[PDB]
Design a protein around this ligand. Structure first.
Ligand SMILES: [O-][O-]
Ligand SMILES: [Fe+2]
Ligand SMILES: [Fe+2]
Ligand SMILES: [Fe+3]
Ligand SMILES: [Fe+3]
Ligand SMILES: [Fe+3]
Ligand SMILES: [Fe+3]
Ligand SMILES: [Fe+3]
Ligand SMILES: [Fe+3]
Ligand SMILES: [Fe+3]
Ligand SMILES: [Fe+3]
Ligand SMILES: [O-]
Ligand SMILES: [O-]
Ligand SMILES: [O-]
Ligand SMILES: [O-]
Ligand SMILES: [O-]
Ligand SMILES: [O-]
Ligand SMILES: [O-]
Ligand SMILES: [O-]
Ligand SMILES: [O-]
Lengths: 164, 162, 162, 162, 162, 164, 162
């Protein structure tokens, strides 16, 4: 009648991963701002907020099922980036990690015959397809136009209102 | 900004982040213990603390500095009652008040008038924060000694400050 | 559909009908004991259970099968308290959830993707049902130990989920 | 109420429930045999019968009694034709009409004016029911001897009685 | 995506394209034989199948793959009657259903949860497709044995599902 | 009183050519998407839809005149393209083919004294003038600005809303 | 205009007038045989033919010519059936189409581009006319073999093309 402990903890850990993603994109916004990419910064701050809502959805599934979500220690998301391109390469990699972890969670759910949690997960499976499309689109814009300061100026302006 | 001020500002941004996560984490305790109204209030307040963090983050970027989100300590705790939880929220907000005062003092000592000015938003906010969390404890002292009293205070929390 | 699936789908249709008449019968106990608010919630939720019936009925007729309404045993029971009555509704919902999960497992085993898909509505509905009925138990545990407590909870149930 | 009138009212409640389940089970036959308009009318009618149960259920609870949903025998049956099914529905309505007149007679001869008054809703409903179900068997006798005629009557049934 | 899944997805996109062209081609038979209502319905449905093709096309591009529209076999056929035409539409839709099931099975076996998820739209759609084309055959069995019956069914088709 | 068999078949064949054009532009949209030209892709998908309506108009003239349109075998439109420019060179060539075939059909109509079909064709004669203008405009934008990744970025954005 | 063109344009003006009075006369047969719907369609279409007259009349006067209304022979005919009557309207339309095509050929031969252009309205109108009148024949072939069939077709004709 209740979630297995395995499933509870994997859901908890994914909630933390969503929280880390939020703090990551927030931290990356600082780099952007520091390096004068205000458009890239605004996009990343809005995307950080979005990741909180992914975190909250997991938190809510956990409480709705009679469990206690646990926010664990959070590693500093601080990193050096050599370019805006390398920053957004890292974003895409991170989103690929999140997709992997959701697929693992879905695999655990099916293997455990946890149909409620499999069903809950579908939101994330779908979301992660949209996330990879979004961030791959940014890398693609940069690989096309990003090799000059003018190109970066334009893409940075695009990012300032992207996905709004 | 002088190094001292950069460091204290960056620390405060991290304290505001921690406040957000703490209130989020307390909302899970509340839901877990059937106080869904207290949970709603703390979830809302967690969102609020993120905006406080954000305001510091943006001051630091505005001034040519690089804010740095440091390792966050887990906010996980046990509480013996909804009262004790809200005693802890109040103590936390008194800590944030104190650090804001220290920051204001440092700004004034360093003749940093742009930061002293920036800080006034927090001084004012922290006055409102303490009044709000005090109000909650006060409600609990009054009515909170029974299941019914907690029931009503919980319901009051569900829409408090909205 | 495979015979196993037809039979388990028809059985679940009948269980949702049973749940309807159960909650309908429960509303009588409530009325009889003066809990007109609990009565009203239970009468509304009896209607909702018939829609869960119809959705299975429809899937069965859509797929070329003839659903059968089988004999329904009397849902009549004694309850010792409002709290015990809602402990029984919660257990009943848990049983429905489990039946649904068995059906989903069966669909998977039988490689019945149409039926696995159809069942997802029930998986999601049952998560909401368990939450609803647990919230009721949780209100009664908290505040339900006095007549005054029960008066308020009954009042809340009069508009709950509307 | 007098024990006799309690029992007769409770049995009528159960007869209304049975009518519901019967018209529901008939709608399945109709779907299986491709009369989806006839199926839709019977599904809607099944829902109306449930409201007729709710009205008796509610009079019993209002008068400080405890209505009991008794065991309901499966309403499953074979039908040789759509016309036969609708002959059966008309027959079942005549039964219901008869049990209502018997209830009205029992109320008047027991000097039970409250219950007499309450029953008038059913006296007038059962007049409307008979004219509705008579109308369908009349349409079928006129036009229902060809596939084309059943086609059109089925279509009329899809939206009949809104 | 794994090679197997790319290939099966690409094949299904091509099956959906073929469905569109088949329904278009059947609409020409219908117009040619004076059933302009059946023609309108099949022209509309051809448009629908293109959106199904399109949804697969976009999943393939989204996932970094290159969808490939292969040689399309002529859909030209003779039909002996409007009934036989609509028997063939139904058989085609059962074929699309089956291939969607195979794709769902493959996705699940390969632990490809993004494709399994993507596929649910089709599982659900194919349930609706079979109900719709079944309804059409069913109408024809009932009423379609005469010029008048075909006349009316044709008119019904002109605005069916709009 | 009826169309000549010559005219019926030439009209049938043009309907198929319009269908092929649709599948062509749809197939070309895949190349664009694959090569990150999402704007070019959206334009080509919208243009594919347009070609279906050209197909349908022929189909309808055929049925209105008591004939049976026939969809024939359709060759795969799959091709390799070395650049976005070369892709849109191919589009223009294709549209030039369609214009040729319509002019041949008009010439057959006049030669056969088929005034109904000549009149019907005028829609296409006019449409093909507008099609060549449209696709020549795209080649011209590319020859002007298309020689850098930045130029391609801008034209690709133009294509994303062109002719809407 | 060349004398050949003036004469063929005037003749066509007279043919469109004839068509008017023909369809008007046909509406009488229909009325007389109780097909008031067919009557009404034919009366509306008689009006439309006069507008085809006026358009040629106007082109003739615009170009400096004097159109002449010549003797119109009685359009009176016997018809054996509604179907035969509409077979005759269709043949009549075919004749008009052919006359128009002859006129267009003449304009081309005479290098009369103004007149070739003017005639295009008629080429396009005549494609629509043949479609309209063929659709009527087609309805009657399908469903017109019974009184009941004819009743429905007559009803459709009462609002056809309005
Ligand atoms: O029975 O109404
Ligand atoms: Fe339930
Ligand atoms: Fe005419
Ligand atoms: Fe996320
Ligand atoms: Fe994300
Ligand atoms: Fe249920
Ligand atoms: Fe009734
Ligand atoms: Fe009834
Ligand atoms: Fe075209
Ligand atoms: Fe074109
Ligand atoms: Fe005319
Ligand atoms: O996520
Ligand atoms: O704070
Ligand atoms: O703060
Ligand atoms: O359910
Ligand atoms: O009744
Ligand atoms: O399909
Ligand atoms: O499909
Ligand atoms: O075209
Ligand atoms: O004409």
């Amino acid at each position: 009648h209740h979630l297995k402990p395995e499933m509870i903890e994997k859901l908890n850990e994914q909630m933390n991963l969503e929280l880390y993603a939020s703090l990551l994109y927030q931290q990356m916004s600082a780099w952007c701002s520091y390096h004068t990419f205000e458009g890239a910064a605004a996009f990343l701050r809005r995307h950080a907020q979005e990741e909180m809502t992914h975190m909250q959805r997991l938190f809510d599934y956990l409480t709705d099922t009679g469990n206690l979500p646990r926010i664990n220690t959070v590693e500093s998301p601080f990193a050096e980036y050599s370019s805006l391109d390398e920053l957004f390469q890292e974003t895409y990699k991170h989103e690929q990690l999140i997709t992997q972890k959701i697929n693992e969670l879905a695999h655990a759910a099916m293997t455990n015959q946890d149909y409620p949690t499999f069903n809950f997960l579908q939101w994330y499976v779908s979301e992660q397809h949209e996330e990879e499309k979004l961030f791959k689109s940014i890398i693609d814009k940069l690989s096309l136009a990003g090799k000059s300061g003018e190109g970066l100026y334009f893409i940075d302006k695009e990012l300032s209102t992207l996905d709004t």
